[PDB]
Symmetry: C3
Subunit: 105 residues, 3 copies
């Protein structure tokens, strides 16, 4: 059952292509910067004038210990870009999932 959590983090960022998204996910998990990553296609509307672009939403599961390192490494992979960077803190998790995630880093 559930345990209240303060040290888990979800890092949400965007990249332009699926190819990049698949590569970033794999190398992030390979490097121990995230335990898992999801990729979701989205359409974004934003001011840059108003642009409408199709991109990939990435959600990286990680801990507060690995977060700063993860965010920097991601930016090193597209240093020209000014990507979305938003982090959420879950208030709870299962014991088992929390332990797997921490063990994977």
């Amino acid at each position: 059952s559930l345990i209240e959590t303060a040290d888990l983090r979800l890092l949400l960022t965007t990249v332009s292509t699926e190819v990049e998204a698949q590569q970033l996910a794999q190398a992030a998990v390979e490097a121990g910067l995230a335990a898992c990553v999801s990729i979701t296609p989205i359409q974004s509307c934003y001011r840059w004038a108003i642009a409408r672009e199709t991109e990939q939403q990435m959600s990286f599961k990680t801990t507060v210990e690995q977060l700063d390192a993860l965010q920097q490494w991601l930016q090193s992979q597209h240093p020209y870009a000014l990507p979305e960077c938003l982090v959420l803190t879950p208030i709870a998790s299962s014991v088992a999932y929390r332990d797997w995630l921490r063990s994977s880093l």
Copy 2:
């Protein structure tokens, strides 16, 4: 109108296929454990069984109250196709008065 909230919860998990996701969503709602469930197709990448895997999955977001969360999670665990399901819980910090009321009422 907007109101600060502390008793709403979004439980996030993933399942393999669309059928699995539809069945689990319907049954949670029918059990009165979630007010609504959203399902989004995703690709995931993770370490499992000593390897890095890339797979297509369905992201699920169960909208519920703190009162039903422990029950929903115990139920999920008995019903989930994965041995170790993803289980992450987010807390909204605000809602409309009318939406907050709708969620709570759906589970009353």
Copy 3:
């Protein structure tokens, strides 16, 4: 600023759903035009809920409005005048960190 994470308390994500892609695109455009959000993202989903006593499953568009707490009230009030549903979903999350560069872009856009 691109490489540095900072704690944020002033950023907000407002989540709602609408029925059609046309609706979503029209709302997202108008929110950015009016300075109420810096960025709006749209994602196709399926949602399951009880309606008129029966379990319904419907295709919808999930929207995520990225904004500040200074604009959040105005956004929500504006949404209620412009949303196609009688009782729209409205859940707001607080990101607790961002990059210096993204937070500044977001603030400067509003």
